[PDB]
Amino acid sequence: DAASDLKSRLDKVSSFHASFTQKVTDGSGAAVQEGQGDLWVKLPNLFNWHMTQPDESILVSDGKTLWFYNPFVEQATATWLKDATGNTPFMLIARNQSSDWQQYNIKQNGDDFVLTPKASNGNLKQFTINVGRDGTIHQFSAVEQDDQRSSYQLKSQQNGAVDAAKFTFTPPQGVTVDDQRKG
Numbered sequence: 001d002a003a004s005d006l007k008s009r010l011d012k013v014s015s016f017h018a019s020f021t022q023k024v025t026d027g028s029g030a031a032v033q034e035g036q037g038d039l040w041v042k043l044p045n046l047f048n049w050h051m052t053q054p055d056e057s058i059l060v061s062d063g064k065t066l067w068f069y070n071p072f073v074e075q076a077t078a079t080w081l082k083d084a085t086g087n088t089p090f091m092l093i094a095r096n097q098s099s100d101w102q103q104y105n106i107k108q109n110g111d112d113f114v115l116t117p118k119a120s121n122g123n124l125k126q127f128t129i130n131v132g133r134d135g136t137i138h139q140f141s142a143v144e145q146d147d148q149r150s151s152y153q154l155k156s157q158q159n160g161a162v163d164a165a166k167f168t169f170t171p172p173q174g175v176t177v178d179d180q181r182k183g
């Protein structure tokens, strides 16, 4: 079915670097903001997301901690990855339990998938992904409770090995770190 097809496309992703553009649109479909940058990914749970435009910001998952670094205000926040990802389909990738997939209704037309949480919890109503049978991810989006859509268009997906140094984060010199990890 759509779920087993999606997982079989996601099984074919190992690690990549991609460039992304970002289009945020309100419920009425008007433009809220535009942005671009780089994404490094390595299954099951590692990523480095670098917005350059319009405002620079870095998200690094080392697989346990999610680091948010905003170099403009020279601040970095550390959170548990499981806390930070809990209102997303993260776990559909980060492990492969039947449990996780049963929390979503999935509709498919070719490379286009829509995932709707059964019980919607958090500000996130809906997710879309466009991913080929080869495992190239062309697009994903998240719809917030107020119908604001964040759309990511990916390109230049290079499926080489990516250095594991991409998924370490050391706060730079004179960056104040707000460590929100309760031990």
Ligand SMILES: CCCCCCCCCCCCCCCC(=O)N[C@H](CSC[C@H](COC(=O)CCCCCCCCCCCCCCC)OC(=O)CCCCCCCCCCCCCCC)C(N)=O
Pocket (backbone or CB within 6 Å): 010, 039, 041, 042, 043, 044, 045, 046, 047, 049, 059, 084, 085, 088, 089, 090, 092, 093, 115, 127, 128, 129, 137, 140, 141, 142, 144, 150
């Ligand atoms: C295999 C390795 C692991 C998976 C790879 C991950 C790929 C990139 C991960 C991070 C990219 C998104 C970061 C943008 C959000 C942002 O800049 N928020 C900034 C500041 S932070 C505030 C923000 C509040 O939340 C928001 O409003 C934004 C929406 C949250 C992002 C959802 C988009 C992804 C869902 C689409 C795909 C669904 C289908 C998957 C099929 C299984 O909350 C957070 O703190 C960020 C937490 C999100 C980080 C994890 C993303 C979960 C992705 C789930 C898997 C998607 C698969 C894509 C590639 C395989 C802001 N201004 O709001």
